[PDB]
Amino acid sequence: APQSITELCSEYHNTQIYTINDKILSYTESMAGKREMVIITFKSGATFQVEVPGSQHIDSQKKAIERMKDTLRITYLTETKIDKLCVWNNKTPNSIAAISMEKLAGF
Amino acid sequence: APQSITELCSEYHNTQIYTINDKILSYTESMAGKREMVIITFKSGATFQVEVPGSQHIDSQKKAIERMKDTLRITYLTETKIDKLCVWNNKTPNSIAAISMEKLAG
Amino acid sequence: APQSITELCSEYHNTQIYTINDKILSYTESMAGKREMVIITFKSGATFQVEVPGSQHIDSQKKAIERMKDTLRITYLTETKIDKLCVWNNKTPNSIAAISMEKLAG
Amino acid sequence: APQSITELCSEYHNTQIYTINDKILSYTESMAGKREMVIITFKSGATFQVEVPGSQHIDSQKKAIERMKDTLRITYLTETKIDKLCVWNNKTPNSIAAISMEKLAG
Amino acid sequence: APQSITELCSEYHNTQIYTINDKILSYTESMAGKREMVIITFKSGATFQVEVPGSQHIDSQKKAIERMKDTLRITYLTETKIDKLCVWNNKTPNSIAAISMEKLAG
Secondary structure (H helix, E strand, C coil), X not given: CCCCHHHHHCCCCCEEEEEEEEECCEXXXXXXXXXXXXXXXXXXXXXXXXXXXXXXCCHHHHHHHHHHHHHHHHHHHCCCEEEEXXXXXXXXXXEEXXXXXXXXXXX | CCCCHHHHXXXXXXXXXXXXXXXXXXXXXXXXXXXXXXXXXXXXXXXEEECCCXXXXXXXXXXXXXXXXXXXXXHHHCCCEXXXXXXXXXXXXXXXXXXXXXXXXX | CCCCHHHHHCCCCCEEEEEEEEECCEEEEECCCCCCCEXXXXXXXXXXXXXXXXXXXXXXXXXXXXHHHHHHHHHHHCCCEEEEEEEXXXXXXXXXXXXXXXXXXX | CCCCHHHHHCCCXXXXXXXXXXXXXXXXXXXXXXXXXXXXXXXXXXXXEECCCCCCCCCCHHHHHHHHHHHHHHHHHCXXXXXXXXXXXXXXXXXXXXXXXXXXXX | XXXXXXXXXXCCCCEEEEEEEEECCEEEEECECCECCEXXXXXXXXXXXXXXXXXXXXXXXXXXXXXXXXXXXXXXXXCCEEEEEEEECCCCCEEEEEEEEECCCC
């Protein structure tokens, strides 16, 4: 198993690491039919999504998707700083595949 | 996929964007038979709901409904400021379809 | 759909609104066989419960029950002030049907 | 339905009320095969568990078990003070059946 | 049932107790296909994971896995101090089997 998000991102095609190093700017959540997703943006202008489980996501990914959206919501509310983001750049906006958060210093 | 709530709201009929820019005033939750919904209001007078799951909804929408109600509760408790709300205005009160929050407050 | 808890409470028999306007005093939770419930009390002496899921509830009320218990726990821990409670008074203690909260401060 | 944890504890054999009146000292959680449980201890030396789901439980308790463990974790993290604990003393360590917390006790 | 994480770790082959006594340094979470896991590291250099659900896990462990991951996320966010970790050292990185957190500090 990978010991790093960037190492994990290396195992997939069409993925890419985006060093965020910033808190989430906006949390968007939709329960609208066929567009049940989450969209997060940062002050950098960068926009990402947790695409709709719509006709092709493994069973192993089902819960992992819900977990990711959970994480994004709480990360937003707590204003926690996101380090990096492993995303699929072949989608618009870029779909989130993994997330990392580092709590540097103050240890 | 849409890159904004405003853009996503544009993809549906009977929907409308309401710039809230305020924290939730009141959280109402019911588990009463046939009406296990949530009703949120703001100091503006505006009232919204996360309607009861029925035939008008699809399967993917089942969890998304639960998530929305979850979000509304925590958003209330943490007194977080809601930016906009994509809602279906052909329902009373207006049913929530999407929600956005901005932390311009950084 | 009702736009108020008061209005929602009006749609059922044996229900009643109790203006609590206070934070929860005690949170009691049981996982004991056949007594899987939650009991909340206030300084007023008032005691309420989220009765055990039985035949009295309907198919699509099962999650609403869990949600209510979730709400009660967090409401307790965060010391949030509960406004009103729509409860069935034909039970002992009074079973909770709906709950409202309103943060009237800034 | 019981209006008190002490009252509820009275409805079972092998149970007993233990006045804790203290915050949790240590939270232990295991996902190890056949040891999916939680163990909490207090500075008084007392140790308790939320035993692994098996036949002693009925389907109703299934979620109530997860809820209890949820409660124990958050109670720990938030350093919330636990009042009493209704536990089955015929188990080692004592299995938790119910829990009570009482705010503004001074 | 074990009354200690150290005691519980003694019941398995290939496990080992690692006295962490520190808050989590980094939380990594992946929903990527076949790599749906969590990776946590500390300033000591130590790296751990909550491996992807497969054959090595029994139907029992399924939820306990999700619980562990839940715990790790909140533990990180709240900057809570982890005391010990019972892990399987026959995996890379070391897979988490149990976790303990002590108070009187944190």
